[PDB]
Amino acid sequence: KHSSDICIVGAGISGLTCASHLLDSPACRGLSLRIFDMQQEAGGRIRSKMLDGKASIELGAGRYSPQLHPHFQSAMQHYSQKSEVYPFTQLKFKSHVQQKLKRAMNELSPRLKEHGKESFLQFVSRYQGHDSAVGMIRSMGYDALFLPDISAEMAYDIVGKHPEIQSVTDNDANQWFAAETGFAGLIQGIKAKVKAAGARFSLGYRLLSVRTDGDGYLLQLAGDDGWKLEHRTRHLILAIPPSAMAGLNVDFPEAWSGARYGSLPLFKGFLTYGEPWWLDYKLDDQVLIVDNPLRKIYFKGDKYLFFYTDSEMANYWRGCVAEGEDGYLEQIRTHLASALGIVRERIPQPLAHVHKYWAHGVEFCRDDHPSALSHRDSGIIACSDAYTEHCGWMEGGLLSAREASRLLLQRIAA
Amino acid sequence: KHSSDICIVGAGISGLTCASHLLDSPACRGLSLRIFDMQQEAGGRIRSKMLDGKASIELGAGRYSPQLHPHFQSAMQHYSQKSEVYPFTQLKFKSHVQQKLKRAMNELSPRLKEHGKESFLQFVSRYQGHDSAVGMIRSMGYDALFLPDISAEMAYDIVGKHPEIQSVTDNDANQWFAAETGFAGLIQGIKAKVKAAGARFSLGYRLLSVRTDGDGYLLQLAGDDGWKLEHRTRHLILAIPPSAMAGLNVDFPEAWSGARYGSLPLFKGFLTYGEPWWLDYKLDDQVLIVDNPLRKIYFKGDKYLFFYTDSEMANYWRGCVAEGEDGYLEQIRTHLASALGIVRERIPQPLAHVHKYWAHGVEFCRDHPSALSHRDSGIIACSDAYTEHCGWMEGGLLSAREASRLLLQRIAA
Ligand SMILES: Cc1cc2nc3c(=O)[nH]c(=O)nc-3n(C[C@H](O)[C@H](O)[C@H](O)COP(=O)(O)OP(=O)(O)OC[C@H]3O[C@@H](n4cnc5c(N)ncnc54)[C@H](O)[C@@H]3O)c2cc1C
Ligand SMILES: Cc1cc2nc3c(=O)[nH]c(=O)nc-3n(C[C@H](O)[C@H](O)[C@H](O)COP(=O)(O)OP(=O)(O)OC[C@H]3O[C@@H](n4cnc5c(N)ncnc54)[C@H](O)[C@@H]3O)c2cc1C
Ligand SMILES: N[C@@H](Cc1c[nH]c2cccc(F)c12)C(=O)O
Ligand SMILES: N[C@@H](Cc1c[nH]c2cccc(F)c12)C(=O)O
Ligand SMILES: [Mg+2]
Ligand SMILES: [Mg+2]
C-alpha cells in the first residue's frame, strides 16, 4: 500500500547518516526505507548558496575542526569532499578590551569549581566589576554568554571551542576548516549513497501525528501543497531537533529522558559589492568583534562580507527585516561605519544581499546523557545533535546517528 | 510601532487590485499601506514558470476571453502586456458521444424551467438513461460536473464559459487569449506600480488571527521562518479566498453572508520532449478530451504537452505523484498511448517535467454581493468567489473594485 519497513523522518546530516549506517548492514537486506522531510531540499540546518553567481556561501554550518570533530573529518574524506583552511581564527584589529581577555580569564579560573554551577555573568562579575564584566563578555561576540540557563562551567567550553576567540584559552592547538564547495556537497554525497541502496525520499511532507497501530506505527503527514497522506512503518526514527518533538503527540520530553532542552536563535546576513572596497583597510580574511549590534563582522577574501549574531541580537535583526529591507540595509551600513571609524558615506551599497534567521538555531541540554533517546513505551527512536556531548555541532549529528542505528538494528535483529 | 493606516492581506490579483485602486484615490494621499502575503511571491493562483530552456508555462490561471473578461483584458492592455491566441477552442476529434451532444444539450434547456436545480447528473438522467447520461457528462472532461453541489443551472453555464466545450452551448463565438510572457508579467506590473506609489510589501508572512481594538485592528502573523509578528492597522481588507477565511478567528461564513462555499482540487502536469514527437500526428495546438485519467490533453505547438484534471481526478494524480515520481511518469505514457490509439512504445520518455496541485483551486459561490463585510467588526473580504465570475480572475478584478470602494465608504464616515 502506502507503507515501509523502516521510516526515517528528517534529512539533516543526522537522519541522512542514520540511513547510511542502516543500509550498510545486512540485517536490513530487502527491507524498504522511506525518508520524509518538511523542506524540499535535504540538509536541514546545512544550507549552502551561490551569492548572485560568484562563489559559495554558508547560511548554516560553516566550519569544523579535525581536532574537535574527528568523525566529521572522516565523513568529509569518506565522501571525498575537499576542505580549505578557515581564515577567521583570530584578531588583528584588537581594541583595548579584547586584549585583556586572555590575561583575565586565564587567572579568572580559581572558582571554576569553588563557586560552581553559578550563571556565567554572575561568576565573572564577582571578581571584576559588573559595569566591567558586561564589557569583557560583550567583547567576545557571542551573546549566548549573558543568559540564565547557561552556567559558568558551560560558558568556558563555548569560548574554547569557537574559532574566533579560542586564543583566550590553551586552545590554539585547534585548526579550523570549511568545505571547499559547501557542506551541501557532503549532504548530496550521503543522499546519493542512500538513494543508491534503494531508499525512497519524500521531501516536502511534514509530520503531524503518530499513532502506534500493532506491530508498527501510523504517521499522518501534510505535504507542503495541502495534500495529506498516511504511512505505516514498522520501525521509526525521528531524526529531528528537540523543538520539533514538542510539536507532536509524543509526550516530549517526559517519555524519553529526564532532561530539559533549550534553544537560541541565530542570524546571518551576507553582502556583496561591485568593488571590493574593504581591502583598503587591510581587512582580507579577517574578523572584527564590535560593541555595535552587528557583533561579528567577517570579510571573505575580496568577494563578500557578512555578519553573525545570536540571542537577542538575532531577534534584533529579524525585527529590522520585518519592518523593511531598506531600513535593514541602511542600519547595517550605519553600524559598519561606526565600526571602521569612518563616515557612513564611505560605505558603498551592495549589489546582492541575502540573509537567513534560525528560530531555533542551536538546541542544547541542561545538565548522564545517552547519544540517542527512546520512548519508554512505543520504542520510537529520536536522533539529534542535542542529546550528545557536542550539543550544537554537526559531530553531534554523526554521533547520535551511529547510536540510533544500532538501537534500531537491535529492535530488528532477534 | 509596527503600525499602518491600511493593510491588505493577500497579494493575488484581487489584493494587488485593491491596492491599485486605493493608491489612485486622493482620500488616501499620504496614508500608509502595507500588504502581507504568506507566499514569498505575489500572484496567488497565478504562477508562471519557465520549463526547461525556453518554455513559458502557466501553472495556474491560463487563458481569458474578451467576451467574458473585459476587465482583465483592459488590465492587460493598461499594463502593456501582450497576449496571443489560445488554440484550444475546438475538438478536432469529437467522439461518437461528443458529436451527439451539442444537440442533446440544446433540447433539455426548457426542462431547466421544469426542474432546474437538480444534480446536473440527476438532470440528464431524465432525458437519457443514467448510463447514457454519464457517458455524455464525462465526455466534457471536467469531472466537477458530477458533483451534486453543482446544479444543472450552473452546469450549463460552466460548460459555456470554458474554451474546450463552449461549442456545445451557444457560446461558440467567444474568443480566447493567453499572455505570452506569462500572466506573472501582469502581476509584476501591478506590484511594481503599487510599490512606486509607496505601498510596502511584507511577503512570506501569514495571518493567524485578528482582534478588534476600537479604532483599528491588531493582526497576529507568523513569518515563514518562524518569527511571530503583531501588526496594528486602521483599515483591513482580506483579499484571500473563502477557504482561507474559514481558517482565521473572524467568524466566517456566518458573520458575513447567508451563503456557504465550496472548492475543488485542480491538477496540471507538463512534459517537454527531446524532439516534438506529436507533429507527425498533426497535433500541435490541438486538445483531446479523453475518458481516461489524463482527461484533457493539450499539445502546445512544438514546445510541450500537458494535461489538466479536477475534482476526484485531481486527487488521483496528487496521489500517484506521492507514490513516487517513477510510475506517475509511466501511467502518463500509458494513457497517452490509449488516447492516440498507438502502442505504448512509440511515445518517448520526457526530459523535463513539472506538475502542480491546488487543494482549493476553484472556490465557488453556492442573493450575493461583490465584496463581503463583517456585520459587527466591518472588515472587508474580497475574492473571485464572491462574484458572478467565481473561479475566474475577472472575479478577483471586480470584487476588488467593489471592495476598494466599499472601504473609502469608511474613510469619510
Ligand atoms: C547558523 C548556524 C551555524 C552553524 N555552524 C556550525 C558549524 O560551523 N559547525 C558545526 O558543526 N555545526 C554548525 N551548526 C549546526 C549543525 O548545522 C547542526 O547541528 C546539524 O545540522 C543538525 O543536524 P540534524 O541532522 O540533527 O537536524 P537538522 O539539520 O536540524 O535537520 C532536521 C531536519 O528534520 C526536518 N524536520 C523537522 N521537523 C519535522 C516534521 N514535523 N516533519 C518532517 N520533517 C521535519 C527539518 O526540515 C530538517 O530537515 C550551525 C547551525 C546554525 C543554525
Ligand atoms: C489551475 C488553475 C487554472 C486557472 N485558470 C484560470 C483561467 O484560465 N482564467 C481565469 O480567470 N482564472 C483562472 N484560475 C483562477 C484565478 O487564478 C483565480 O480566480 C484568481 O487568481 C483569484 O485570485 P485572488 O486574487 O482571489 O487570490 P488568490 O490568487 O486565490 O490568492 C490570494 C493570495 O492570498 C494569500 N493568502 C491566503 N491566505 C492567507 C493567510 N491566512 N495569510 C496570509 N496570506 C494569505 C494566498 O497565498 C495568495 O497569494 C485558475 C486557477 C487555477 C488553480
Ligand atoms: N554556529 C556556531 C555554534 C554556536 C553559536 N552560538 C552558540 C551558542 C552555544 C553553543 C553553540 F554551539 C553555539 C558556530 O559553529 O560557530
Ligand atoms: N478557471 C478554471 C475554471 C474551472 C475548472 N474546473 C471548474 C469546475 C467548476 C467551476 C469552475 F469555474 C471550473 C479553468 O478555466 O480551468
Ligand atoms: Mg537530521
Ligand atoms: Mg488577492
CSV table of C-alpha atoms and ligand atoms in Angstrom, one decimal, chain B residues 12-15 239, ligand 6:
chain,number,residue,atom,x,y,z
B,12,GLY,CA,-3.2,37.7,-5.6
B,13,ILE,CA,-4.8,39.7,-8.4
B,14,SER,CA,-7.6,40.7,-6.1
B,15,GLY,CA,-5.4,42.1,-3.3
B,239,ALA,CA,-8.1,39.5,-0.3
C,6,MG,MG,-5.8,38.5,-4.0
